Amino acid sequence: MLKGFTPWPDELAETYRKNGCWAGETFGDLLRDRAAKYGDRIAITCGNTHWSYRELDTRADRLAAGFQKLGIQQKDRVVVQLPNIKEFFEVIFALFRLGALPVFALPSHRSSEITYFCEFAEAAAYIIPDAYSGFDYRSLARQVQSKLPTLKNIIVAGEAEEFLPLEDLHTEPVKLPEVKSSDVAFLQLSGGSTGLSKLIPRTHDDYIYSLKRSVEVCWLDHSTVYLAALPMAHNYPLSSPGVLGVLYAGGRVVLSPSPSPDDAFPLIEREKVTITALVPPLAMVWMDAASSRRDDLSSLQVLQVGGAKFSAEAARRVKAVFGCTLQQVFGMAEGLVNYTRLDDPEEIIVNTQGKPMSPYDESRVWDDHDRDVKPGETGHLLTRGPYTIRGYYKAEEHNAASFTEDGFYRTGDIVRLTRDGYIVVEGRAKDQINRGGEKVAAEEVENHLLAHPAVHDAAMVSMPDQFLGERSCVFIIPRDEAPKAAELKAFLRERGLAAYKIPDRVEFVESFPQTGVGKVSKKALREAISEKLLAG
Numbered sequence: 001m002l003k004g005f006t007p008w009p010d011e012l013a014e015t016y017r018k019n020g021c022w023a024g025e026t027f028g029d030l031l032r033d034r035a036a037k038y039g040d041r042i043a044i045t046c047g048n049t050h051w052s053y054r055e056l057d058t059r060a061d062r063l064a065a066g067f068q069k070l071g072i073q074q075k076d077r078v079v080v081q082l083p084n085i086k087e088f089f090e091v092i093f094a095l096f097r098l099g100a101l102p103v104f105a106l107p108s109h110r111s112s113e114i115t116y117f118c119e120f121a122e123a124a125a126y127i128i129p130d131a132y133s134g135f136d137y138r139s140l141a142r143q144v145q146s147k148l149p150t151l152k153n154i155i156v157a158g159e160a161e162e163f164l165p166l167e168d169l170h171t172e173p174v175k176l177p178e179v180k181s182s183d184v185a186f187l188q189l190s191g192g193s194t195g196l197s198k199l200i201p202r203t204h205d206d207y208i209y210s211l212k213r214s215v216e217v218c219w220l221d222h223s224t225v226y227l228a229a230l231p232m233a234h235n236y237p238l239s240s241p242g243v244l245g246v247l248y249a250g251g252r253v254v255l256s257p258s259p260s261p262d263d264a265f266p267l268i269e270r271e272k273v274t275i276t277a278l279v280p281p282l283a284m285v286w287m288d289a290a291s292s293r294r295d296d297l298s299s300l301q302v303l304q305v306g307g308a309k310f311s312a313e314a315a316r317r318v319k320a321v322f323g324c325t326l327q328q329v330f331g332m333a334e335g336l337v338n339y340t341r342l343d344d345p346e347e348i349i350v351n352t353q354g355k356p357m358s359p360y361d362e363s364r365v366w367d368d369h370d371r372d373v374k375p376g377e378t379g380h381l382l383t384r385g386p387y388t389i390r391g392y393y394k395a396e397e398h399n400a401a402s403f404t405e406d407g408f409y410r411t412g413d414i415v416r417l418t419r420d421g422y423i424v425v426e427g428r429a430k431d432q433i434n435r436g437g438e439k440v441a442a443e444e445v446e447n448h449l450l451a452h453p454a455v456h457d458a459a460m461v462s463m464p465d466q467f468l469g470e471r472s473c474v475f476i477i478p479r480d481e482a483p484k485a486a487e488l489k490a491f492l493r494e495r496g497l498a499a500y501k502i503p504d505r506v507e508f509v510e511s512f513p514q515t516g517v518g519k520v521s522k523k524a525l526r527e528a529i530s531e532k533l534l535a536g
């Protein structure tokens with residue numbers, strides 16, 4: 001057992017292995033199997049290059065041997081920070097076959113976060129591309145080493161300079177140590193706020209199960225052509241169903257250079273993508289673009305939007321702008337993933353954030369005092385299941401606060417449950433605005449503002465007030481010429497919005513600060529409004 005990992009209770013583990021949730025197969029097996037069945041099928045597409053399943057299988061074996069020869073051992077952690085390129089895949093499955101643990105960093109991470117990941121995880125290696133999106137990662141590597149002289153295996157996919165060329169590692173395959181389906185397979189990152197994310201241990205069994213359910217719930221098959229538009233190392237574009245779900249089903253993954261329509265649209269028409277995944281802010285950009293671009297996105301069958309709540313006023317437009325089915329996805333790297341079903345009524349797809357994907361996912365909505373709220377009532381969401389961790393990596397204190405004594409994980413979201421078990425998310429507990437003794441659901445107000453013809457997007461956050469404790473500020477991205485602030489308040493007033501929900505202040509910006517995967521960082525917005533106030 002990996003040191004720092006919190007296992008599922010023995011009796012539950014058995015239940016899961018008995019009902020078949022935990023298949024007992026490793027990622028190594030998964031690839032070996034798929035490679036044997038349809039080796040010639042194209043698994044990955046990137047620009048003009050392609051990789052068959054057999055190809056990936058072979059490179060993974062040959063790379064694992066190189067990694068081992070390098071001195072990387074079973075249980076070793078390896079911080080992987082690659083863009084959406086083919087290497088990512090040979091890198092993780094090779095690590096998977098050596099029993100080494102990838103730690104999934106994002107392209108946007110810098111020395112402060114990377115140095116942390118390498119120290120905390122006591123990383124044996126750091127894997128980066130030479131340069132991506134205008135950033136030279138070797139300079140980041142140099143910054144990291146100067147902070148951690150002990151990190152001596154810096155692997156670069158591309159021009160390595162003084163470091164180690166990933167391409168020079170492949171060698172003759174070898175006998176590798178046994179990897180158990182119950183072993184931790186990798187460490188993911190949590191996505192809250194306050195920098196330093198917690199590390200999340202996921203085992204082969206519990207993760208592959210999450211992939212199998214996502215495949216079934218999302219109808220993926222040999223005909224699936226999934227476009228990876230978001231940084232694919234994030235839990236959402238990696239497994240819900242993600243690039244890994246697509247490989248599980250024998251489909252084909254297309255790698256986009258960036259999330260932007262300029263890059264993605266041609267790819268959708270050229271490669272005939274049948275499904276892609278976006279986060280709300282990007283969904284807005286795609287919808288605007290889809291109305292000004294002449295690309296043929298007709299092959300699109302399913303457009304996923306998640307990571308954050310995709311407001312009703314926007315969601316309802318998917319069918320007409322893209323002519324495909326919208327699928328809201330509400331998941332967390334900690335475990336639980338919810339989806340609106342592909343054959344659900346338009347209203348359920350447009351007004352909810354789905355229902356647990358597993359029959360064994362347990363959900364509870366509690367009130368501030370850990371008491372189950374009354375049916376249909378709004379409250380704190382706790383969850384427990386086959387693919388939901390029981391604790392963060394080496395984090396006793398935080399675990400004491402994040403998990404109930406019995407095993408439920410407090411997701412940090414405020415939600416209410418529907419009759420059929422669907423979840424209607426209000427927003428995160430931390431994003432609640434308590435204006436002078438009144439709670440305000442930010443997203444409720446943003447949805448209204450999205451109805452205004454001059455609003456591209458809106459993010460409402462709290463701001464300090466010495467008299468009311470908290471006031472509300474909404475950041476608006478103008479859909480061209482920015483309307484006046486009084487015009488927006490009046491708009492909301494005309495709609496009958498309760499007076500205390502109306503933004504006290506309006507800030508116009510060209511874009512919102514975002515997180516690694518692309519969601520709006522309300523924390524950054526709070527800092528920005530808080531700073532402006534201090535300026536006075």
Ligand SMILES: Nc1ncnc2c1ncn2[C@@H]1O[C@H](COP(=O)(O)OC(=O)c2cccc(O)c2O)[C@@H](O)[C@H]1O
Pocket residue numbers: 189190191192235236239240305306307308309310328329330331332333334337353411412413425427428
């Ligand atoms: N659809 C939706 N609606 C409202 N809030 C949502 C949401 N999706 C995610 N969230 C917020 O994000 C955390 C989970 O954070 P991450 O680990 O960074 O993950 C994801 O955001 C995510 C999105 C879609 C699918 C999957 O698998 C993941 O992991 C939630 O607790 C919530 O606050």
